Design an enzyme around this catalytic site. Structure first.
Site, PDB file in Angstrom:
ATOM      1  N   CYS A   1       0.764  -1.243   0.000  1.00 20.27           N
ATOM      2  CA  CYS A   1       0.000   0.000   0.000  1.00 20.27           C
ATOM      3  C   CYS A   1       0.792   1.287   0.000  1.00 20.27           C
ATOM      4  O   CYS A   1       0.564   2.155  -0.846  1.00 20.27           O
ATOM      5  CB  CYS A   1      -1.046  -0.029   1.088  1.00 20.27           C
ATOM      6  SG  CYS A   1      -2.228  -1.331   0.637  1.00 20.27           S
ATOM      7  N   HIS A   2       1.724   1.425   0.931  1.00 19.32           N
ATOM      8  CA  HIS A   2       2.549   2.626   0.977  1.00 19.32           C
ATOM      9  C   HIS A   2       4.018   2.321   1.273  1.00 19.32           C
ATOM     10  O   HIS A   2       4.772   3.202   1.677  1.00 19.32           O
ATOM     11  CB  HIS A   2       1.993   3.623   1.982  1.00 19.32           C
ATOM     12  CG  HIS A   2       0.539   3.904   1.807  1.00 19.32           C
ATOM     13  ND1 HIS A   2      -0.404   3.252   2.549  1.00 19.32           N
ATOM     14  CD2 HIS A   2      -0.075   4.738   0.932  1.00 19.32           C
ATOM     15  CE1 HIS A   2      -1.567   3.688   2.117  1.00 19.32           C
ATOM     16  NE2 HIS A   2      -1.417   4.590   1.139  1.00 19.32           N
ATOM     17  N   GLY A   3       4.411   1.062   1.104  1.00 18.27           N
ATOM     18  CA  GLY A   3       5.798   0.684   1.307  1.00 18.27           C
ATOM     19  C   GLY A   3       6.383   0.613   2.705  1.00 18.27           C
ATOM     20  O   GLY A   3       7.364   1.278   3.003  1.00 18.27           O
TER      21      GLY A   3
END
Ligand code: FES
EC number: 7.1.1.8
Lengths: 127, 123, 107
Positions: free
Chosen positions: B88-90
């Site tokens: 999703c956002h690392g």
């Protein structure tokens, strides 16, 4: 990786104090587990000396509890052993080691020092 | 209250099981991973926890597979720290499931669990 | 205080075959029994903890069984650097105590 480097006087005169330093690199003493000291006698019988936790709590073997003192220095990241009034009895190779602790499997010494051989001789040695 | 049969889980494999609609991650860790987990200095962790503060038996990593950032489910055996990666956002988690890099502020939560022979009871 | 008895005491074997050492304690220890390997050069390593769990790096040929008060440490083949002194400790209560030791020689 964690590394334990031991150093100190490899020969002390009886009635004096033996002082060994255990330098740890790659992991702080305050970060976690238990920091132990053990000795190996020539008659091949390992003995647990004691420890100091990451908090600073001590736990010594009742056999030597009244003589030793295991302290530390968070700044330089190293703990020390100080066995008072030594005797020919205290002639052994000393080891410092880390022991983990899991509520199920219990303690286990996973990282060992090189091992410093100490002799309680009346001989003279250049400091 | 979910019961998982640990005897069924192979050596270095991940198993995901549902508990209250949330995914529960269970890994049968290898000896090398166990060392990797307990040999990390707190100075390198935004959420300081020893591997022992997170597991009861070093062989079994049991946690809620819910990314602490915005709730996605981290992908197993991925990332730059040998653990889980949140697409999703690392966010990267290590072999103890602690947050090592990314926007997530906390380590993967550990749910309450008790052992009973070859099976663990999550709940 | 508890005390272990490592038997056989310093027994030798061939260049590649099974061997079974043991550790019996005076009192009863759950399974809190670890095993250490002391190399001839003085280097000591952890081999087994909690009676059967292997440590990182120790080859698959090492086992570990027992319970209550009787324990073991089996090997597949001593090929070629299994030559060292093996110890065993307990940790159910302080102070921790080790065994007498068990040297492994090659004829
Ligand atoms: S939800 Fe995992 S990184 Fe944003």
């Amino acid at each position: 990786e964690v590394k334990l480097q031991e150093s100190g006087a490899g020969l002390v005169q009886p009635s004096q104090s033996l002082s060994l330093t255990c330098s740890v690199t790659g992991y702080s003493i305050t970060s976690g587990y238990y920091w132990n000291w053990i000795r190996l006698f020539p008659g091949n019988k390992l003995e647990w000396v004691g420890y100091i936790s990451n908090v600073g709590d001590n736990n010594y073997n009742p056999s030597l509890k009244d003589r030793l003192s295991i302290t530390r220095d968070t700044s330089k990241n190293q703990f020390f052993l100080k066995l008072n009034s030594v005797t020919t009895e205290d002639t052994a190779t000393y080891y410092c080691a880390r022991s983990e602790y899991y509520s199920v499997t219990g303690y286990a010494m996973d990282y060992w020092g090189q091992g410093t051989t100490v002799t309680v001789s009346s001989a003279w040695r250049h400091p | 209250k979910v019961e998982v049969n640990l005897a069924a889980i192979p050596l270095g494999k991940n198993v995901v099981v549902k508990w209250q609609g949330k995914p529960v991650f269970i890994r049968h860790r290898t000896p090398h991973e166990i060392q990797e987990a307990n040999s990390v200095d707190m100075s390198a962790l935004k959420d300081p926890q020893t591997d022992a503060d997170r597991v009861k038996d070093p062989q079994w990593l049991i946690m809620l597979g819910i990314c602490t950032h915005l709730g996605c489910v981290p992908i197993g055996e991925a990332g730059d720290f040998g653990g889980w990666f949140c697409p999703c956002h690392g966010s990267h988690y290590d072999i103890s499931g602690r947050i090592r890099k990314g926007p997530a502020p906390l380590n993967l939560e550990i749910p309450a669990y008790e052992f009973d022979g070859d099976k663990v009871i999550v709940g | 205080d508890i005390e272990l008895t490592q038997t056989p005491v310093s027994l030798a074997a061939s260049l590649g075959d099974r061997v079974t050492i043991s550790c019996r304690a005076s009192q009863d220890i759950n399974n809190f029994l670890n095993w250490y390997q002391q190399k001839p050069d003085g280097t000591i390593k952890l081999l087994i903890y909690y009676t059967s769990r292997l440590h990182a790096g120790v080859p698959s040929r090492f086992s570990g069984s027992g319970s209550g008060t009787d324990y073991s440490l089996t090997i597949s083949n001593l090929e070629p650097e299994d030559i060292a002194t093996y110890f065993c400790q307990h940790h159910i209560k302080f102070p921790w105590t080790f065994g007498a030791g068990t040297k492994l020689e090659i004829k």
